[PDB]
């Protein structure tokens with residue numbers, strides 16, 4: 001059974017057993033100078049930005065972006081599961097320019113990305129909304145260990161005992177890295193508030209100037225209500241064994257502030273006290289609504 005196993009430590013970080021088992025293949029990954037790396041802590045807007053990027057690369061052409069599922073269009077690099085998927089091999093066989101997805105903490109990223117000085121788009125999302133999203137995701141996406149109860153999962157998340165390790169270190173270290181490499185550091189909440197502005201930031205970073213009409217086309221097709229019903233973007237092409245959408249849909253709510261529906265007031269106060277202690281060494285600032 002490839003599903004529901006315990007995580008395995010990889011250079012200090014809990015990862016899926018099969019990623020750990022094939023780690024040398026990940027660490028030796030060969031990047032290319034024109035790769036665009038989308039880097040996120042899980043549940044922070046990876047699919048959203050991956051769809052935006054593929055739409056940009058295809059000039060807002062919806063049909064072209066339906067050539068395959070997002071997880072084939074924008075391969076999840078480190079995700080290797082025997083009999084199921086191999087992100088490294090998918091990318092190895094993909095023509096440039098490649099869009100590459102990762103959730104790896106900075107210290108675990110294959111060094112080829114640094115050596116090739118690749119452009120990277122990092123997306124961060126407020127921790128409270130992340131942990132709620134990740135809880136439901138753990139339930140539906142069977143490669144993860146059992147999340148337990150909300151209360152149990154919340155504690156594991158705060159302790160960094162979840163797949164890809166602690167959110168706090170992930171966002172903080174990636175933030176620091178922006179001083180060394182070309183990292184456009186985006187926030188899920190900004191994309192919610194003003195998607196046009198954020199996509200304009202992406203275009204400037206990519207050194208692309210496109211017509212307003214194409215920009216509006218990209219905006220329309222990357223909206224939650226369009227993506228949620230789009231089989232090429234909403235993960236419903238996954239086998240039920242890998243992802244069971246009847247448990248929780250991948251495109252779940254797509255808002256900011258769902259944490260209010262999940263956290264008890266006590267859980268919130270405790271989470272905030274812990275958060276301030278973990279995040280005061282950082283100039284990083286988030287909005288929770």
Ligand SMILES: Nc1ncnc2c1ncn2[C@@H]1O[C@H](COP(=O)(O)OS(=O)(=O)O)[C@@H](OP(=O)(O)O)[C@H]1O
Nearest residue numbers: 042043044045046047133222223224251252253254
């Ligand atoms: N277009 C658009 N607009 C707004 N929100 C969106 C969009 N697409 C995905 N989502 C929401 O993003 C959450 C999934 O994040 P990820 O794509 O990073 O998940 S994953 O790490 O790639 O598995 C998950 O958030 P929750 O709804 O809070 O669970 C998705 O619903």
Ligand SMILES: O=[N+]([O-])c1ccc(O)cc1
Nearest residue numbers: 071076079084085143242
């Ligand atoms: O099989 N799976 O569970 C997968 C496969 C590919 C992917 O990008 C994410 C999950």
Ligand SMILES: O=[N+]([O-])c1ccc(O)cc1
Nearest residue numbers: 042043046141143144242
């Ligand atoms: O376990 N999974 O199937 C996953 C996990 C993380 C992710 O971003 C996509 C799929």
